[PDB]
Symmetry: C2
Subunit: 123 residues, 2 copies
Amino acid sequence: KMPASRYLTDMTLEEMSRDWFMLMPKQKVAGSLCIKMDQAIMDKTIILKANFSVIFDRLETLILLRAFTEEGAIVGEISPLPSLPGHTGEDVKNAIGVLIGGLEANDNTVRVTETIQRFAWRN
Amino acid sequence: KMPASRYLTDMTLEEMSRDWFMLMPKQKVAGSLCIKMDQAIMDKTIILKANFSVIFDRLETLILLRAFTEEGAIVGEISPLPSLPGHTGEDVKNAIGVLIGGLEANDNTVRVTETIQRFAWRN
């Protein structure tokens, strides 16, 4: 059987659609997720925001995660690769780890939105 | 004081961002909303989908509403005009009325998503 998914996001349409580039690229393909990070970004305050699929008041699938600075610049991204099989809850948690890890290594203050917290807390 | 807004949507990123055209335009500026409808669309099954801002598990502001056919074609839209002052709950309800009205006049079966239902029920 099949219910019919809705989407809950921390980001506005523009924040999600917006094209961005990295001065010093770094990409990892952990799980079935693509993790992008600009290694030229240092000593900034980053906020991890996300878009999740939601079935019965519960977050199910990660559609898109993006790292923003206080000024509003995209510095990182976690997104699923359509070609590969569906990502797991652990894959999402590990990806966020890799992104937070990498960003903090360049002396950045990384905080996450309650939506990512709730997702991670419940898997 | 002001709390941080999140967004709940029935539509996918593509469905929201997608550009669409009307062979027979009909546009109205009711409230602080722009109401678009293709009067060339007849004898089809329309489904009204939406994007609302959500604060404390309660829908607050309409971000975007779009009318889709069973095949997935955009036949109508309700969207706020940023230049004008914030739209009211009644403005949204009246707009949906105008859209459903106009679409049914061209012998169409118009059904709405539960998100629009909940919004309208509570204003």
